[PDB]
Structures are given as structure tokens and as C-alpha cells.
């Protein structure tokens, strides 16, 4: 702890989602039915502590590694060393997109070709918390997989894609839920377009490049909330006031943030109390 | 602002030429006298060079519209790519000496498609905004490099990831060992495919996003670094980082160092500062 809190001086649309390796394309708020979120990737406190399956690098985000025997995939850590089931949900980096089927692109060290692995996260065979998931036709061998595209969940039949959810890792001690804190504030999300047969937008709490910055800096959290300005890098104009909270999330008061340009920069202004009332965006 | 590097262990970081974890530190074979990678290029005062993006979400990716014969490239956010003096759109893969296999997906459509890329033919002209479709049907796609294989031409050549592709039919500059027994240092990643492929880059991607944000003034000819064990704080080896954005060491070598250490800035020094062999 040698330096006060800062955020990267980088425009948002140049940064990445922290739940999949996708560029950020917009700022968003959640639909009315979403009362909290509990993402397991993209979780980092303002003083740089990773939570959940969150890796510090995008090269580990929304990836799996393991050995298929034709019936199950026995998971490992992404570097191939053993995954030991524990109180938590899954190996570091494991995808955390609930409310959809996954289509994971599987490749191999020492073999040609790629294979699409179709993952329904709802059946009893999907237990990454215990180190295994159904092979669903993936032949025997060792693979690394990265999430490629998504589709509506296979069960319940006819349900819609809902990326505000996390999967059923168990048959679990999770990174904690994030709640709107009051004072008219709503949670702010960094959105990315996800391929697949709809207009899918994947929300996350922090760009991945913020996470690697915070994890390296480990700046002291010296107030209840960090007042930020979302700034136009050309003019320096303040486009909107936001608060970042220690657990690692941002809020604003909508007038909204979805209408803001995506090429701005979040800039730390001051530590403030949780009672600090924001000007509507 | 003082110069710093991230306080993060190397094996937790990513290659800057493909979205792959770093698995070792390496040096080049004797026949490699320089490198000219176009991704993973960032000066010590935080200026990106070449096709290098600041985020791994843009690394080794393509975007464009196939008409069944050619893919007309765009920037990765879909806005127009304008041919210019430089090599290709930001993020475009820079792995020479191999065929690429790119996983193509689409916004608003199901499925993925493997796109097989020989970078040697007359049709591979990303510098002019187009590459051969090689059977990819009409549509708009985003592609990410997935695996590689031996280059289709020259016939029988083997994979050589020290090379860059033939973008044309003005590049980030070449990087040279500076003298004094020093050799270039590379961050290596295992790349999927049928061979035992190791992809070198000059800088971890997370160093690039750090430098681009910090933009610490380059106040000397070289930055003396220590590669430090985070448990003991012991110096495992002396390295120098040079302003163009690369590291060197004097091998005794770096390939035997553990990969879970941290590079730490020690002092600005002259280019002539003599390193202790690793």
C-alpha cells in the first residue's frame, strides 16, 4: 500500500468484460426483476482482493480444462494441475453464465482440430463444485475450452437467456451477492455483445483490466465509497457521477447510464461516505 | 510518475500475441537475430505500437464480412477499417510461420465455424483490407485464433512463431539484442495444435495495459529489473527493459527460472550497465 486509489486511464470501450473475453460495448443497468447479482467472475475488491473464480487475467476467463473419459470431464486447474473440490464453486476461471446453454470451443495440446462442447448447466451431471461435468459426446482426451457462444437454456424448455444468473455449480460457498445500496442508487454494469442466436448482452461488475490494476495496486480503502467521474478524455467534461464500493462494484442514480458514450474514462475524485448523494446521470 | 511494473506473478498473466496463459520465460534460437512482432508492442512510457490492442479481448482476432470469396475486414467493433501505411486492423493476428485456425462466430446467429488461413498467398492482404474466405459463407463474423498448424507454403516448412505474416502484397520496428552479451527475453505460452508449439511475445498483455495507463516518463536508457520470488523476496535474476518495450538478460538461463515470480523495477541505468548472468 504505497499509492492512493486509482482506476486505469483507459477508455471503457477499449477494455474487456470479466465474465467472457469480449470487448465492452455499453454501460447498462439491470432489468426491474433483477434485485441482486452474484457473479463469480469479475469480482475484485477496491483494495485488490480477488473473489470467487475470478482470475487476474482474461486468458483464464470463461475457460475449462480437464480430461474426458467419454462420459464425464474431470476438471483440473487451467494450467493442468489438480483441481481439489472445496467449499467454493469451481476452478478458477470457470464460466459463470447462468440462464443459458454454453457452447465451448475445445482444443488440445498435441492434436489438431477444435470441437464444440454443448453444456446444459441444469442437469444432475453438472457438478463443477465436485470437479466433474458431463462430456455430452466429447471423446476421451485432455482439452482446454473457452466459451464461444451461448443459446437459450435447454431446461426449463422455452425459458429465455438470462445472463443476470449464475449456474448451479453444486448438486456452495460463493462470492457474496451485490445489492443496490440505497439512496436511489442502482448497480452499474459493463456490457458486452455475446454471439449466439439472439441480441445477447453480458453484464459484469468490473472490466477485466480494472481487476488486474486493483490486484496489483492494492490501494488502501480509506472511505466507504469512492466518488468517480465518468470523463470525456477530449474535453475533460464530467459526464456523470458514480460511486464505487469496496466489495468491487459501481452505482449511479439514473435521471441514464445506458445513454452515455462508451469511450469515456472513469476517474477517481475522492473517498466519500455511503450517504453521499449522487447527481442523477 | 515513477516507472513501475505490475506486482503480479508471471504465470498468472497472458501472452500478448494470443489469449493464452504464460507458461515459461524463453530466449530465441540462435538463428533468430531480431523480432518484429506487431502485437504485444508497447513502449515503457505507454505508447502502443503496431496492431497491439490494450486489452486481450482484442488480441489475435478478426472481424469482417464474407461474400463467399473474400472477407472484407473491419475494426473489431465493426466500424470501418481504412487501409493505411500500416499492416492490418488493430488486434489482427501476427503469427507468421504457420497456418491459422480461427473460430468464427456471429452476433444473432447460432454456431461456430473453423476458418483455415494460409497467410502466404496473393489473396492474404490485410494491409489492403481483405483476406481469402476459403469457404466461409457470406455473412458478418468475429473470429479468434483457436489453434495453429504447419504453414501450407513453402511446402513442408515447419512452424516458426518467431515470424510475422506477410500482411502486404510500415510496421512496428524490429527489436534487436543491444550488445554486452544480452539476449532478448520472451514470455512463452503453449499454443494448441498438433505440434508442441510455444508462442513467444515481448510483454505480458497485463504489462501493456499497465504501461498504457501509467505512461511513466522514460527517464533513463534502460530500466534495471529484478525477477523476484514473492515468498522470500530473493532476486532470482537481473534483467533490463528498454524504452521500445522489451526485456533482456545475460544467460549464464532464464528458461530454468520459475514462472511464478514478479518483475520489479530497481533503477534507471545506462544502456551499458552490465548485468549479472542469470
Amino acid at each position, epitope marked *: 500500500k504505497t499509492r492512493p486509489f486509482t482506476l486505469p*486511464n*483507459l*477508455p471503457l470501450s*477499449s477494455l474487456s468484460n470479466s465474465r467472457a473475453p469480449l470487448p465492452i460495448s455499453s454501460i447498462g443497468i439491470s432489468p426491474d426483476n433483477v434485485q441482486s447479482v452474484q457473479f463469480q467472475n469479475g469480482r475484485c475488491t477496491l483494495d485488490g482482493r480477488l473473489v470467487g473464480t475470478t482470475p487476474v487475467s482474461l486468458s483464464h476467463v470463461a475457460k475449462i480444462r480437464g480430461t474426458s473419459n467419454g462420459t464425464v470431464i474431470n476438471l483440473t486447474e487451467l494450467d493442468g494441475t489438480p483441481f481439489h473440490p472445496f467449499e467454493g464453486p469451481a476452478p478458477i476461471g470457470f464460466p459463470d453464465l447462468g440462464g443459458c446453454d454454453w457452447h465451448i470451443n475445445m482444443t488440445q495440446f498435441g492434436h489438431s482440430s477444435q470441437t464444440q462442447y454443448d453444456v446444459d448447466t441444469t442437469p444432475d451431471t453438472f457438478v463443477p463444485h465436485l470437479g466433474s461435468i458431463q462430456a455430452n459426446g466429447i471423446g476421451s482426451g485432455n482439452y482446454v475450452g473457452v466459451l464461444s457462444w451461448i443459446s437459450p437454456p435447454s431446461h426449463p424448455s422455452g425459458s429465455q437467456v438470462d445472463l443476470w444468473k449464475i449456474p448451479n455449480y453444486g448438486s456452495t460457498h460463493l462470492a457474496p451477492s451485490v445489492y443496490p445500496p440505497g439512496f436511489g442508487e442502482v448497480l452499474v454494469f459493463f456490457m458486452s455483445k455475446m454471439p449466439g442466436p439472439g441480441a445477447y448482452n453480458l453484464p459484469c461488475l468490473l472490466p477485466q483490466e480494472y481487476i488486474s490494476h486493483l490486484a496489483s495496486e492494492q490501494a488502501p480503502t480509506v472511505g466507504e465509497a469512492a466518488l468517480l467521474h465518468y470523463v*470525456d*478524455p*477530449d*474535453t*475533460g467534461r464530467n459526464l456523470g457521477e458514480f460511486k464505487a464500493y469496496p466489495d468491487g462494484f459501481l452505482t449511479c442514480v439514473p435521471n441514464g447510464p445506458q445513454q452515455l458514450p462508451i469511450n469515456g*474514462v472513469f476517474v477517481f475524485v475522492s473517498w466519500v461516505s455511503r450517504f453521499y448523494q449522487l447527481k442523477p446521470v | 510518475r515513477p516507472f513501475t511494473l505490475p506486482n503480479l506473478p508471471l504465470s498468472s498473466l497472458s501472452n500478448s500475441r494470443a489469449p493464452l496463459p504464460i507458461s515459461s520465460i524463453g530466449i530465441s534460437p540462435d538463428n533468430v537475430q531480431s523480432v518484429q512482432f*506487431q502485437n504485444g508492442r508497447c513502449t515503457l512510457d*505507454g*505508447r*502502443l*505500437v*503496431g*496492431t*497491439t490492442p*490494450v486489452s486481450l479481448s482484442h488480441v489475435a482476432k478478426i472481424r469482417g464480412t464474407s461474400n463467399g470469396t473474400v472477407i472484407n475486414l473491419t*475494426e473489431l*467493433d465493426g*466500424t*470501418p*477499417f*481504412h487501409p*493505411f*501505411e*500500416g*499492416p*492490418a*486492423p*488493430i488486434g489482427f493476428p501476427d503469427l507468421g510461420g504457420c497456418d491459422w485456425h480461427i473460430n468464427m462466430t456471429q452476433f444473432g446467429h447460432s454456431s461456430q465455424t473453423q476458418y483455415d488461413v494460409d497467410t502466404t498467398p496473393d489473396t492474404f492482404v490485410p494491409h489492403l483490407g481483405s483476406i481469402q474466405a476459403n469457404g466461409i459463407g457470406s455473412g458478418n463474423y468475429v473470429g479468434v485464433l483457436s489453434w495453429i498448424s504447419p504453414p501450407s507454403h513453402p511446402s513442408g516448412s515447419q512452424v516458426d512463431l518467431w515470424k510475422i505474416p506477410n500482411y502486404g502484397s*510500415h*510496421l*512496428a520496428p524490429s527489436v534487436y539484442p543491444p550488445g554486452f552479451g544480452e539476449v532478448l527475453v520472451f514470455f512463452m505460452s503453449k499454443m494448441p495444435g498438433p505440434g508442441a508449439y510455444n508462442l513467444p511475445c515481448l510483454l505480458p498483455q497485463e504489462y501493456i495495459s499497465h504501461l*498504457a495507463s501509467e*505512461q511513466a516518463p522514460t527517464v533513463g536508457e534502460a530500466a534495471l529489473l529484478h525477477y523476484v520470488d514473492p515468498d522470500t523476496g530473493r532476486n532470482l535474476g537481473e534483467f533490463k527493459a528498454y524504452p521500445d518495450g522489451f526485456l533482456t538478460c545475460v544467460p549464464n538461463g532464464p528458461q530454468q527460472l520459475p514462472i511464478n515470480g514478479v518483475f520489479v523495477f530497481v533503477s534507471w541505468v545506462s544502456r551499458f550497465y552490465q548485468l549479472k548472468p542469470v
Partner: nanobody, 116 residues
Framework: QVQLQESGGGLVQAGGSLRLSCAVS????????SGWFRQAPKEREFLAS????????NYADSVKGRFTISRDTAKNTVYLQMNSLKLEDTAVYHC??????????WGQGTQVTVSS
């Protein structure tokens, strides 16, 4: 090295018009923002920016409606069309380029003197 070179300044009567140009060369990155700044003897003032790929523009309030920024992708040149010039527009005008959020590249500048 990235090189920016302005041209087109000089003496102009108040209420008149002037077109500045900025030739960009040595560029290895395919997209960026080109910007026009000015400085009077008075900190440096941002005036206008344009994104290379899609020509998205952004203007300072001081010049909105009077100055127009544009770019020619074939000639790799950025232009500032300055109409209804005011005495207070007298300054040295600089073009600049930002790959990300910071203007890292600057031209040498061209003087614009607005006279009565």
C-alpha cells in the same frame, strides 16, 4: 515514428474563414482519434476530435457550430474548417493524435492571427 504536420495558418479577417490541414504519417495503428488544439499566450484548449474509423466527432463548446473537423482516409489528413473567426480565436493551432485516452503525438503547430 508517428509524424503530424499542420498547414494552412496565417492572417485572416475577423468573420472570415480558414481551413487547416494535418498530415498524419508513420502510423502503425489502424484506428485512433485525431484532435485539434490551440494555445494562446491561457492553457492549451481542446477544440475538436474525430475518430478515424467512423468519423465520430466531438467539439468544445467554444467552437461548436463554427469549426468543423473532418478527415480523408485516402490522404491520411485531418482538417479543421474554421468559419466565423473571432479575434479571440488567435492562437497557435496544433493537431494531435490519441491511440487510447491520451494525446501522445503532437504537430509543431501553425499560427492563426485574426485581425480587425
Amino acid at each position: 515514428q508517428v509524424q503530424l504536420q499542420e498547414s494552412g495558418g496565417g492572417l485572416v479577417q475577423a468573420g472570415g474563414s480558414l481551413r487547416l490541414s494535418c498530415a498524419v504519417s508513420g502510423r502503425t495503428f489502424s484506428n485512433y482519434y485525431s484532435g485539434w488544439f490551440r494555445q494562446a499566450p491561457k492553457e492549451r484548449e481542446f477544440l475538436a476530435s474525430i475518430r478515424w474509423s467512423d468519423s465520430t466527432t466531438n467539439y468544445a463548446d467554444s467552437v461548436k457550430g463554427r469549426f468543423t473537423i473532418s478527415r480523408d482516409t485516402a490522404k491520411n489528413t485531418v482538417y479543421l474548417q474554421m468559419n466565423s473567426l473571432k479575434l479571440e480565436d488567435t492562437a497557435v493551432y496544433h493537431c494531435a493524435a490519441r491511440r487510447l485516452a491520451t494525446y501522445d503525438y503532437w504537430g509543431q503547430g501553425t499560427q492563426v492571427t485574426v485581425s480587425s
